[PDB]
Amino acid sequence: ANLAAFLVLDRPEERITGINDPRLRNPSDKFIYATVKQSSVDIYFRRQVC
Amino acid sequence: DNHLSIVTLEEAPFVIVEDIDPLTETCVRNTVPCRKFVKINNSTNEGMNV
Predict the structure, then answer these.
(1) Residue A9 phi, psi dihedral angles, 5° rounding
(2) Could you give the CA distance from residue B4 to residue A16 in angstroms, rounded to a whole number?
(3) Annotated binding site of A for glycine
(4) Are B30 and A46 a contacting pair at CB < 8 A?
(5) What is the DSSP letter of B21?
(6) Rounded distance, CA A25 to CA A16, Å?
(7) In chain A, what is the straight-line distance between the N-terminal and C-terminal CA atoms, in Å?
(8) Strand runs labelled E in chain B
């Protein structure tokens, strides 16, 4: 049972699901991520109410 | 009576006041003008409407 549980509950590759993912919301220094330049990603980020 | 004053606090994660960026812009976008009495000295209670 322990082997099966630890094999089906191993480390998952799922690190984000979208803009609404809570892990993306927090700008913690542990997880560093940013856009490359001032491309349309920057415009989309600037054009958000929240 | 179209102009009515509104008073708010900053003790909860629902109202946040930030200094205006010195880049000839009024808090970029999605902002409301605010007033706060910034105390000058430990004795005088004069506050500029920043």
Answers:
(1) -120, 45
(2) 45
(3) 40
(4) no
(5) P
(6) 10
(7) 45
(8) 37-39, 47-49
Three-point CA angle B29, B35, B37, nearest 5°? 140
Three-state SS at B4: coil
This structure was determined by cryo-EM
- Which residue, chain included where needed, has tokens 């089906």? A8
* Resolution of the structure in the document, Å: 4.3
The tokens of A41 are what?
């990603």
The 3-state secondary structure of chain A reads CHHHHHHHCCCCCCCCCCCCCHHHHCCCCCCCCCCCCCCHHHHHHHCCCC
- B residues 3-32 closer than 8 Å to A (CB): 28-30
Question: How far away is chain A from the Cα of B1, in angstroms, using its nearest Cα?
Answer: 30
Chain A residues closer than 8 Å to B28 by CB: 46
Structure tokens that stand for B19 in this block: 């200094």
